[PDB]
């Protein structure tokens, strides 16, 4: 596997490390999404310590309105983060 291929599988690896914790094992609920951002995005995103912030993140990511973040929705989130880091370095 190339670096890019490793990065692709890392995205799947990490999503499932969090989505697999509780309930639907293929989607992130609020607490799973919260721990993902807090543990895995600490250098890009501000630590989440408030419920209103958890709710707002979920609302923003949850395109289909089912209260959880699926893999497609997680990818859109990765894209918004990756693009912000990209433009940071212009």
C-alpha count within 13 angstroms, C-beta hemisphere, residue 45 = 20
Asked if 66 touches Ca ion (CB under 5 A), the answer is: yes
83 binds, among its own copies, Ca ion, none (CB under 5 to 8 A by kind): its own copies
Report the residue from 31, 39, 64, 83 that binds Ca ion according to the rule CB under 5 A.
Answer: 64
Asked if 36 touches Ca ion (CB under 5 A), the answer is: no
Residues that bind its own copies (CB under 8 A): 1-15, 36, 39-44, 71-72, 75-76, 78-79, 81-83, 85-86, 89
d(CA 35, CA 53): 13
**Residue 68: CB minimum distance to its own copies, A:** 16
| Nearest alpha-carbon partner for 73 in 11, 22, 17, 23 | 11
Asked if 72 touches Ca ion (CB under 5 A), the answer is: no
Neighbour-count burial of 22, counting CB atoms closer than 10 A to its CB (0-12 exposed, 13-18 middle, 19+ buried): exposed
């Amino acid at each position: 596997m190339s670096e890019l291929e490793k990065a692709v599988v890392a995205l799947i690896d990490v999503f499932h490390q969090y989505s697999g914790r509780e309930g639907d094992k293929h989607k992130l609920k609020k607490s799973e999404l919260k721990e993902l951002i807090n543990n895995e995005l600490s250098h890009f995103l501000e630590e989440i310590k408030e419920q209103e912030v958890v709710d707002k993140v979920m609302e923003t990511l949850d395109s289909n309105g089912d209260g959880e973040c699926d893999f497609q929705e997680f990818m859109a989130f990765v894209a918004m983060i990756t693009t912000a880091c990209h433009e940071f370095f212009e």
